[PDB]
């Protein structure tokens, strides 16, 4: 059975944990984005 | 005939009473629950168009 024995063997100290599920796991949310781009340059250094 | 016409005036007194005490108002709150899981998820944006942006064309140079 596999996964299933664990999947399946449900009880009411599961429900604090996956009743009324609020998240899932498998499928992400992404955040609004804005595109970036960097760059790398010297600066001058005034003085010896 | 007269008890008759004492109680009809009494009777109505409390009727009177009754119809102005009736329109008393009720007020309705609203009260506002979070989305459920496979509703959230069938509303969810496709990651195709919430940050489409990154390839539009570039950040150091125009278009």
Known sequence: ?48 | TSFVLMLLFTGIILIATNELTYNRPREIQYRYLPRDLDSFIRTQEMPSAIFSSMWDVDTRRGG
Do not use: C, H, M, W
């Open chain 1, 1 to 48: 059975a596999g996964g299933l024995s664990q999947l399946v063997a449900y009880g009411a100290q599961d429900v604090y944990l996956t009743g009324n599920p609020q998240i899932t796991f498998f499928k992400t949310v992404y955040r609004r984005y804005t595109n970036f781009a960097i760059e790398s340059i010297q600066q001058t250094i005034n003085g010896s």
